[PDB]
Amino acid sequence: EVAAVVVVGSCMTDLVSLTSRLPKTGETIHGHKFFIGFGGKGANQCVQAARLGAMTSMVCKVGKDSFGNDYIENLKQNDISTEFTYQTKDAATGTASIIVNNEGQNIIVIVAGANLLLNTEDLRAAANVISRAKVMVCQLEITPATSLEALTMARRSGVKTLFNPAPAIADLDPQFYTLSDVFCCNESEAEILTGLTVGSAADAGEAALVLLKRGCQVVIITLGAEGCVVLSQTEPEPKHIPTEKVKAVDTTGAGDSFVGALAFYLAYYPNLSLEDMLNRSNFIAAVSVQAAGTQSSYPYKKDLPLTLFLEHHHH
Amino acid sequence: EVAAVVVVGSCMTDLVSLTSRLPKTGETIHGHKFFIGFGGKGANQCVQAARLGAMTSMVCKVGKDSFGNDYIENLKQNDISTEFTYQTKDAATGTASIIVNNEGQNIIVIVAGANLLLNTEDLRAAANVISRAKVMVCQLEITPATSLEALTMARRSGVKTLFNPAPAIADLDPQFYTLSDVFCCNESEAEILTGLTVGSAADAGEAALVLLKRGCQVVIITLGAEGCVVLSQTEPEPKHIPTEKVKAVDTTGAGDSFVGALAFYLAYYPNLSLEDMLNRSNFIAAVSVQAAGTQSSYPYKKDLPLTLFLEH
Ligand SMILES: Nc1ncnc2c1ncn2[C@@H]1O[C@H](COP(=O)(O)CP(=O)(O)O)[C@@H](O)[C@H]1O
Ligand SMILES: Nc1ncnc2c1ncn2[C@@H]1O[C@H](COP(=O)(O)CP(=O)(O)O)[C@@H](O)[C@H]1O
Ligand SMILES: [Cl-]
Ligand SMILES: [K+]
Ligand SMILES: [K+]
Ligand SMILES: [Mg+2]
Ligand SMILES: [Mg+2]
């Protein structure tokens, strides 16, 4: 019935061309395959949460176009509520044009498009759904002011905020930190936000402390194959949560799998320690890296170990 | 209604992102605008001819996908026959993914897709329409075997062949020249095809002669703002046909406008001199450069000077 996880954020149509070599400036090349995929950090996170069993709702804006209609169907196919998936005639659906060579290297051009037109009126119409959620997740692929509005609304209603400052902006409004219950970013984002080098767990501990002092309640920095680091106002000493070693097929979208899993745990297992939530989220994201693609790689509950769903702390 | 102009060639969806900077390897950048356009050199040429008043037929193959369905509607809206516009589940509609910066530099990735699956069986179904046409137009965006068969069919029925070797490749099948009544390309294509540097109308004349001696009857090299150069087996001395100076808004698709205009004139105004046809085609192409986009820039007869359509 009630959506426990509300994601206010982005949907993007992935337009993928496969080539033998990447083009340089000025070059026309021929590729050998083109296909369409569904992306956007907001939708990616929402899709992972939904596949773990969350009742989710996506607050987003697409175009009144073929891509937008397709995106709505993609959400429905993932059992996501589309009651706040808005459409606009005033911009195309967001796009990621992606060129990939035979080694899996890419160039990407993102046009946020309709995502940027998600506005105050849209959030007001979503106010009841936001207010009744357990967790509100947002990123920085819509207009920053709209993400800030959503954080504000959630905070005012006592709804847990999960903020993923991605892609990062060097001088974020200070309110982004003070309105974030959980602030989760990757190493490259942490570098932009703090002006520190972040390559290692040690580095992430230092960066996390800078972010915590700006007013976050919890800070998590993800570290690829090294797992993640967390600290909080209650426990300000950095804790490194490793992830078990796997053979990565395709790491694309791992960050969004991680965040979607964390949203699921915050909503449905609020009793658990951060450490527990993060061990589980690490494991889920590590499953995603062992499969090709972004949304297509995200696991479903039925294909995951039963231990990930126990109410109490586990070893 | 008998089609006078038959175009056997490509339909492509243009997926255009406008950016401040072009991305380097491994980089994600954010751009400021995305749009979809109808393109493909075959379709572009067919659309310009149709807008001038030609009865046209587009022989092509698109996907059984949204892009393909949309493409078919695009052709119908331009009054083009789609009797031999095929759809396949075996590849997506052709795509051109185009990134452009604010200085107009670009990165382009073409995936010809369904265009490549237009096969000789598909062509043969069109034999009656080809046989009753005045002009057959082909390019180098579908499979070579298919384009060669189309030109062969036209020749067998005494239908004029107009061939646009675009995009160009160094080692083009010799038959493309010998099957071409009119062979029309741009300066950068002529350079690839001949190995000559083309940096003037005089240089274009020299490259054109190489193309002529490979077996073409008429060779036209288009020269952007400098108009075009023509020679023929009957008159091998190069003739430079200037175009009047205009303020270009967007030169994208001008070559296809030029070729589609030329097809229209070859089909419906056969008694005009070649020089006259090229002056008119230059003028129509120069209108196209004064508007943004490709097919959205191609003028209609109703918006053009009446003198372009007077005989003699
Ligand atoms: N190679 C790898 N092996 C195992 N887990 C991985 C992994 N790459 C990523 N992960 C998992 O996915 C989470 C998020 O990944 P990232 O820190 O890589 C985000 P990004 O920096 O690539 O955008 C990690 O914290 C970890 O749990
Ligand atoms: N800047 C410009 N001013 C006027 N006419 C132009 C022009 N650029 C192109 N044209 C017209 O369009 C014709 C074809 O253009 P191009 O020679 O540039 C072929 P392409 O660059 O589209 O491949 C020219 O012969 C000329 O008639
Ligand atoms: Cl920009
Ligand atoms: K993956
Ligand atoms: K134009
Ligand atoms: Mg990673
Ligand atoms: Mg040009």
PDB file of N, CA and C and ligand atoms in Angstrom, chain B residues 41 185-189 221-228 241-248 251-259 278 281-290, ligand 2:
ATOM      1  N   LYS B  41      21.265   9.892 -45.645  1.00  0.00           N
ATOM      2  CA  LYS B  41      21.461  10.640 -46.876  1.00  0.00           C
ATOM      3  C   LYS B  41      20.372  10.314 -47.898  1.00  0.00           C
ATOM      4  N   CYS B 185      29.735  14.378 -55.568  1.00  0.00           N
ATOM      5  CA  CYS B 185      30.322  14.247 -54.239  1.00  0.00           C
ATOM      6  C   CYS B 185      30.858  15.599 -53.780  1.00  0.00           C
ATOM      7  N   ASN B 186      31.264  15.689 -52.513  1.00  0.00           N
ATOM      8  CA  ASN B 186      31.837  16.902 -51.970  1.00  0.00           C
ATOM      9  C   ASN B 186      33.373  16.872 -52.016  1.00  0.00           C
ATOM     10  N   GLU B 187      33.990  17.956 -51.530  1.00  0.00           N
ATOM     11  CA  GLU B 187      35.441  18.068 -51.705  1.00  0.00           C
ATOM     12  C   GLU B 187      36.178  16.993 -50.896  1.00  0.00           C
ATOM     13  N   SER B 188      35.718  16.740 -49.659  1.00  0.00           N
ATOM     14  CA  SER B 188      36.431  15.796 -48.808  1.00  0.00           C
ATOM     15  C   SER B 188      36.270  14.374 -49.340  1.00  0.00           C
ATOM     16  N   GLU B 189      35.103  14.052 -49.914  1.00  0.00           N
ATOM     17  CA  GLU B 189      34.908  12.777 -50.596  1.00  0.00           C
ATOM     18  C   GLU B 189      35.827  12.645 -51.793  1.00  0.00           C
ATOM     19  N   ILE B 221      31.507  18.060 -58.344  1.00  0.00           N
ATOM     20  CA  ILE B 221      32.071  18.166 -57.011  1.00  0.00           C
ATOM     21  C   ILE B 221      31.503  19.439 -56.398  1.00  0.00           C
ATOM     22  N   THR B 222      30.838  19.280 -55.252  1.00  0.00           N
ATOM     23  CA  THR B 222      30.284  20.430 -54.550  1.00  0.00           C
ATOM     24  C   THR B 222      31.370  21.019 -53.659  1.00  0.00           C
ATOM     25  N   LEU B 223      31.294  22.346 -53.489  1.00  0.00           N
ATOM     26  CA  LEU B 223      32.396  23.122 -52.924  1.00  0.00           C
ATOM     27  C   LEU B 223      31.877  24.071 -51.846  1.00  0.00           C
ATOM     28  N   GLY B 224      30.847  23.677 -51.104  1.00  0.00           N
ATOM     29  CA  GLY B 224      30.326  24.577 -50.071  1.00  0.00           C
ATOM     30  C   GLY B 224      29.969  25.942 -50.648  1.00  0.00           C
ATOM     31  N   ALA B 225      30.477  27.007 -50.015  1.00  0.00           N
ATOM     32  CA  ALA B 225      30.139  28.362 -50.382  1.00  0.00           C
ATOM     33  C   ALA B 225      30.662  28.742 -51.758  1.00  0.00           C
ATOM     34  N   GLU B 226      31.582  27.940 -52.332  1.00  0.00           N
ATOM     35  CA  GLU B 226      32.088  28.176 -53.674  1.00  0.00           C
ATOM     36  C   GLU B 226      31.227  27.531 -54.767  1.00  0.00           C
ATOM     37  N   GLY B 227      30.089  26.918 -54.409  1.00  0.00           N
ATOM     38  CA  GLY B 227      29.167  26.392 -55.393  1.00  0.00           C
ATOM     39  C   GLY B 227      29.567  24.964 -55.778  1.00  0.00           C
ATOM     40  N   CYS B 228      29.818  24.751 -57.075  1.00  0.00           N
ATOM     41  CA  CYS B 228      30.208  23.424 -57.529  1.00  0.00           C
ATOM     42  C   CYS B 228      31.018  23.530 -58.803  1.00  0.00           C
ATOM     43  N   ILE B 241      30.515  26.642 -61.241  1.00  0.00           N
ATOM     44  CA  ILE B 241      29.210  27.257 -61.070  1.00  0.00           C
ATOM     45  C   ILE B 241      29.147  27.836 -59.661  1.00  0.00           C
ATOM     46  N   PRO B 242      29.339  29.169 -59.492  1.00  0.00           N
ATOM     47  CA  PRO B 242      29.268  29.785 -58.168  1.00  0.00           C
ATOM     48  C   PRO B 242      27.836  29.796 -57.661  1.00  0.00           C
ATOM     49  N   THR B 243      27.698  30.040 -56.344  1.00  0.00           N
ATOM     50  CA  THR B 243      26.416  30.241 -55.683  1.00  0.00           C
ATOM     51  C   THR B 243      26.481  31.629 -55.031  1.00  0.00           C
ATOM     52  N   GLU B 244      25.369  32.354 -54.890  1.00  0.00           N
ATOM     53  CA  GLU B 244      25.449  33.672 -54.263  1.00  0.00           C
ATOM     54  C   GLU B 244      25.717  33.518 -52.761  1.00  0.00           C
ATOM     55  N   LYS B 245      26.380  34.537 -52.200  1.00  0.00           N
ATOM     56  CA  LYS B 245      26.796  34.569 -50.811  1.00  0.00           C
ATOM     57  C   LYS B 245      25.563  34.792 -49.931  1.00  0.00           C
ATOM     58  N   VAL B 246      25.442  33.952 -48.904  1.00  0.00           N
ATOM     59  CA  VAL B 246      24.396  34.021 -47.908  1.00  0.00           C
ATOM     60  C   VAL B 246      25.040  33.896 -46.530  1.00  0.00           C
ATOM     61  N   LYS B 247      24.273  34.224 -45.486  1.00  0.00           N
ATOM     62  CA  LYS B 247      24.723  33.997 -44.120  1.00  0.00           C
ATOM     63  C   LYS B 247      24.239  32.625 -43.692  1.00  0.00           C
ATOM     64  N   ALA B 248      25.173  31.676 -43.565  1.00  0.00           N
ATOM     65  CA  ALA B 248      24.824  30.311 -43.229  1.00  0.00           C
ATOM     66  C   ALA B 248      24.468  30.228 -41.746  1.00  0.00           C
ATOM     67  N   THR B 251      25.031  24.534 -42.062  1.00  0.00           N
ATOM     68  CA  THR B 251      25.279  23.947 -43.369  1.00  0.00           C
ATOM     69  C   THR B 251      24.994  22.450 -43.379  1.00  0.00           C
ATOM     70  N   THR B 252      24.615  21.848 -42.241  1.00  0.00           N
ATOM     71  CA  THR B 252      24.333  20.424 -42.177  1.00  0.00           C
ATOM     72  C   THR B 252      23.249  20.063 -43.194  1.00  0.00           C
ATOM     73  N   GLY B 253      23.499  18.994 -43.977  1.00  0.00           N
ATOM     74  CA  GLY B 253      22.530  18.464 -44.921  1.00  0.00           C
ATOM     75  C   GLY B 253      22.469  19.196 -46.268  1.00  0.00           C
ATOM     76  N   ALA B 254      23.357  20.165 -46.516  1.00  0.00           N
ATOM     77  CA  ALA B 254      23.321  20.916 -47.767  1.00  0.00           C
ATOM     78  C   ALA B 254      23.605  20.028 -48.978  1.00  0.00           C
ATOM     79  N   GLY B 255      24.555  19.074 -48.833  1.00  0.00           N
ATOM     80  CA  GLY B 255      24.854  18.167 -49.927  1.00  0.00           C
ATOM     81  C   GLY B 255      23.625  17.367 -50.341  1.00  0.00           C
ATOM     82  N   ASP B 256      22.853  16.905 -49.356  1.00  0.00           N
ATOM     83  CA  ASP B 256      21.665  16.109 -49.656  1.00  0.00           C
ATOM     84  C   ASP B 256      20.570  16.976 -50.280  1.00  0.00           C
ATOM     85  N   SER B 257      20.444  18.222 -49.842  1.00  0.00           N
ATOM     86  CA  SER B 257      19.518  19.151 -50.485  1.00  0.00           C
ATOM     87  C   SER B 257      19.884  19.345 -51.963  1.00  0.00           C
ATOM     88  N   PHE B 258      21.176  19.512 -52.218  1.00  0.00           N
ATOM     89  CA  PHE B 258      21.714  19.708 -53.570  1.00  0.00           C
ATOM     90  C   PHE B 258      21.409  18.497 -54.444  1.00  0.00           C
ATOM     91  N   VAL B 259      21.653  17.301 -53.905  1.00  0.00           N
ATOM     92  CA  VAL B 259      21.459  16.087 -54.694  1.00  0.00           C
ATOM     93  C   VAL B 259      19.969  15.870 -54.942  1.00  0.00           C
ATOM     94  N   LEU B 278      22.341  22.971 -62.294  1.00  0.00           N
ATOM     95  CA  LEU B 278      23.263  23.098 -61.167  1.00  0.00           C
ATOM     96  C   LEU B 278      23.146  24.475 -60.510  1.00  0.00           C
ATOM     97  N   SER B 281      20.079  24.048 -58.385  1.00  0.00           N
ATOM     98  CA  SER B 281      20.326  23.160 -57.267  1.00  0.00           C
ATOM     99  C   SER B 281      21.186  23.881 -56.218  1.00  0.00           C
ATOM    100  N   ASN B 282      22.194  24.619 -56.678  1.00  0.00           N
ATOM    101  CA  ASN B 282      22.992  25.469 -55.810  1.00  0.00           C
ATOM    102  C   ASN B 282      22.091  26.419 -55.001  1.00  0.00           C
ATOM    103  N   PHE B 283      21.116  27.044 -55.679  1.00  0.00           N
ATOM    104  CA  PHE B 283      20.262  28.035 -55.033  1.00  0.00           C
ATOM    105  C   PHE B 283      19.433  27.371 -53.933  1.00  0.00           C
ATOM    106  N   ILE B 284      18.834  26.220 -54.246  1.00  0.00           N
ATOM    107  CA  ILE B 284      17.998  25.514 -53.282  1.00  0.00           C
ATOM    108  C   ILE B 284      18.836  25.053 -52.090  1.00  0.00           C
ATOM    109  N   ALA B 285      20.025  24.514 -52.346  1.00  0.00           N
ATOM    110  CA  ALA B 285      20.915  24.097 -51.265  1.00  0.00           C
ATOM    111  C   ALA B 285      21.319  25.307 -50.418  1.00  0.00           C
ATOM    112  N   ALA B 286      21.527  26.476 -51.040  1.00  0.00           N
ATOM    113  CA  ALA B 286      21.901  27.661 -50.280  1.00  0.00           C
ATOM    114  C   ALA B 286      20.743  28.157 -49.402  1.00  0.00           C
ATOM    115  N   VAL B 287      19.494  27.929 -49.806  1.00  0.00           N
ATOM    116  CA  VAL B 287      18.370  28.197 -48.919  1.00  0.00           C
ATOM    117  C   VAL B 287      18.463  27.293 -47.690  1.00  0.00           C
ATOM    118  N   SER B 288      18.778  26.012 -47.903  1.00  0.00           N
ATOM    119  CA  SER B 288      18.813  25.062 -46.795  1.00  0.00           C
ATOM    120  C   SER B 288      19.835  25.494 -45.741  1.00  0.00           C
ATOM    121  N   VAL B 289      20.963  26.094 -46.154  1.00  0.00           N
ATOM    122  CA  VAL B 289      21.977  26.434 -45.161  1.00  0.00           C
ATOM    123  C   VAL B 289      21.518  27.595 -44.294  1.00  0.00           C
ATOM    124  N   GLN B 290      20.446  28.282 -44.702  1.00  0.00           N
ATOM    125  CA  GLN B 290      19.963  29.428 -43.936  1.00  0.00           C
ATOM    126  C   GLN B 290      18.918  29.053 -42.892  1.00  0.00           C
TER     127      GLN B 290
HETATM  128  N1  LIG C   2      27.998  28.279 -46.908  1.00  0.00           N
HETATM  129  C1  LIG C   2      27.257  28.079 -47.989  1.00  0.00           C
HETATM  130  N2  LIG C   2      26.762  29.141 -48.676  1.00  0.00           N
HETATM  131  C2  LIG C   2      25.998  28.914 -49.756  1.00  0.00           C
HETATM  132  N3  LIG C   2      25.685  27.747 -50.319  1.00  0.00           N
HETATM  133  C3  LIG C   2      26.209  26.716 -49.620  1.00  0.00           C
HETATM  134  C4  LIG C   2      27.020  26.790 -48.505  1.00  0.00           C
HETATM  135  N4  LIG C   2      27.400  25.527 -48.069  1.00  0.00           N
HETATM  136  C5  LIG C   2      26.825  24.719 -48.934  1.00  0.00           C
HETATM  137  N5  LIG C   2      26.140  25.378 -49.910  1.00  0.00           N
HETATM  138  C6  LIG C   2      25.433  24.801 -51.031  1.00  0.00           C
HETATM  139  O1  LIG C   2      25.228  23.444 -50.747  1.00  0.00           O
HETATM  140  C7  LIG C   2      25.918  22.644 -51.755  1.00  0.00           C
HETATM  141  C8  LIG C   2      26.407  21.376 -51.130  1.00  0.00           C
HETATM  142  O2  LIG C   2      27.246  21.679 -50.003  1.00  0.00           O
HETATM  143  P1  LIG C   2      28.663  21.000 -49.725  1.00  0.00           P
HETATM  144  O3  LIG C   2      29.592  21.238 -50.860  1.00  0.00           O
HETATM  145  O4  LIG C   2      29.083  21.684 -48.428  1.00  0.00           O
HETATM  146  C9  LIG C   2      28.359  19.266 -49.317  1.00  0.00           C
HETATM  147  P2  LIG C   2      28.224  18.838 -47.500  1.00  0.00           P
HETATM  148  O5  LIG C   2      29.257  19.674 -46.694  1.00  0.00           O
HETATM  149  O6  LIG C   2      26.774  18.992 -46.979  1.00  0.00           O
HETATM  150  O7  LIG C   2      28.627  17.406 -47.402  1.00  0.00           O
HETATM  151  C10 LIG C   2      26.996  23.578 -52.311  1.00  0.00           C
HETATM  152  O8  LIG C   2      27.389  23.157 -53.620  1.00  0.00           O
HETATM  153  C11 LIG C   2      26.230  24.899 -52.333  1.00  0.00           C
HETATM  154  O9  LIG C   2      25.359  24.958 -53.447  1.00  0.00           O
END
